[PDB]
Structure 1
Amino acid sequence: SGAIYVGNYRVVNRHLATHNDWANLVWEDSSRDLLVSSTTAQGCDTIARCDCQTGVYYCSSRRKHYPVSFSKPSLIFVEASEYYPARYQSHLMLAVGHSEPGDCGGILRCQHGVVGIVSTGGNGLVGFADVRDLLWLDEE
């Protein structure tokens, strides 16, 4: 679990969105595993606007913050699950690092701010949904 709080937006994995999130929907994209809902309180996060390939992410299944090198956002095939059939997930970045299904929502940060959130994983791999291209999160 986990979410990003920027201005009056809450960014969550779409598969973990609540019914309140859906009632207050701003934007969602199933192919990205993202959903953004509106908030009443202002959050304390800043979104990175950069092409960084290094950073640190939080791993709940280890209670640890790990430094990582990660790939560029791309279309990556993700196996079928209880939330989606097998498909290409877009804007995904992979890294060698520990993850388990419950780690989704863990934030990845670089020196410029929030880069994305854990969305996928594998045997010694972790995948992050990028948020740096969503320029509108910084305004309106």
Structure 2
Amino acid sequence: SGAIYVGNYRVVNRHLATHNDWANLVWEDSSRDLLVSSTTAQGCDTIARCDCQTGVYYCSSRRKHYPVSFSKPSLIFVEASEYYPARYQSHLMLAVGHSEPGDCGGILRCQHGVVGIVSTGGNGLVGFADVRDLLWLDEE
């Protein structure tokens, strides 16, 4: 589990969105595993606007933050899970790092701010849904 709180937005994995998220929906995209809902309180996270390929992510199954090198956002085939059939996911970045299904939502960050959230993984890989192209998260 986990979310990014930026401005009056909450960014979560689409597959973990709550009824309150759907009833306060701003934007969602199944092909990216992302959903954004509105919030009453202002958040403290800032979004990175950069091309970093190194950062640090939070892994709940280890209660630890790990440094990682990650690929550029791409279209990658993701295996079937309890939440999606096997399909192509867009804007996904892969890295070598531990992950388990419930690690989705952990933040990946660089020196510039939040880069994305854990979305996929297995066998010593972890995949992150990028958010750096969503420029509208920084305004209104």
Q: TM range, normalised to the smaller chain? A: over 0.9
Unaligned 5+ segments in structure 1 are: none
SS of equivalent residue, structure 2 residue 137? helix
Shift of the alpha carbon at 1:122?
1.4
SS of equivalent residue, structure 1 residue 47? coil
SS of equivalent residue, structure 2 residue 40? coil
Partner of 1:47: 47
Partner of 1:86: 86
Shift of the alpha carbon at 1:113?
0.1
Aligned equivalents of 1:52 and 1:26: distance in 2? 27
Aligned equivalents of 1:79 and 1:68: distance in 2? 22
Structure 1 or 2: more strand by fraction: 2
Shift of the alpha carbon at 1:131?
0.3
Aligned equivalents of 1:126 and 1:75: distance in 2? 15
SS of equivalent residue, structure 1 residue 57? strand
**CA-to-aligned-CA distance 1:71-104 (integer Å, 9 cap, x gap):** 0000010112222111100000000000000000
SS of equivalent residue, structure 1 residue 8? strand
Aligned length: 140
**What's the RMSD between the two structures over aligned residues?**
0.5
Aligned equivalents of 2:35 and 2:15: distance in 1? 8
Aligned equivalents of 2:56 and 2:112: distance in 1? 12
TM-score normalised according to structure 2 size = 0.99
Shift of the alpha carbon at 1:19?
0.4
TM-score normalised according to structure 1 size = 0.99
SS of equivalent residue, structure 1 residue 2? coil
Aligned equivalents of 1:3 and 1:55: distance in 2? 17
Aligned equivalents of 1:58 and 1:80: distance in 2? 24
SS of equivalent residue, structure 2 residue 61? coil
Shift of the alpha carbon at 1:130?
0.1
